[PDB]
Amino acid sequence: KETAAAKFERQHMDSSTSAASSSNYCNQMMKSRNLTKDRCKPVNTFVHESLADVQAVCSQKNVACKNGQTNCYQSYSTMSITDCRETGSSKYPNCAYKTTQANKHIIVACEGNPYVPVHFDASV
């Protein structure tokens, strides 16, 4: 049983690079994080910052989530992120992605004790 806090780190954290090293970054990471296991996840964001810096966003700017919920929080600083989206050719199990580098503010939904990120909502 994977906790929601643990699943967020598997799906979104990559503190090991300052940014996506190549255009094949997503194809490789989507596969290695088990995100293409039973279906090709259509969109996924990776964050290249320390976990402590990402966990601290839960104490920053409170904003509404895309689904109307109110437990979302936006980062005061921009963060290095990599946006992964399926290409027109992608077809399970042969999932394929486009890698795009960006530096944006991130919005995550927090929950629990301690209060941590459990869902990546969007970037602005």
Curated annotation (Swiss-Prot):
It is found in: Secreted. It catalyses: an [RNA] containing cytidine + H2O = an [RNA]-3'-cytidine-3'-phosphate + a 5'-hydroxy-ribonucleotide-3'-[RNA]; an [RNA] containing uridine + H2O = an [RNA]-3'-uridine-3'-phosphate + a 5'-hydroxy-ribonucleotide-3'-[RNA]. GO terms for cellular component: extracellular region. One of its GO terms (biological process) is defense response to Gram-positive bacterium. One of its GO terms (molecular function) is ribonuclease A activity. Its main location: secreted. Endonuclease that catalyzes the cleavage of RNA on the 3' side of pyrimidine nucleotides. Acts on single-stranded and double-stranded RNA. This is Ribonuclease pancreatic. It comes from Bos taurus. The gene is RNASE1. The chain holds residues 27 to 150 of 150 of the full protein.
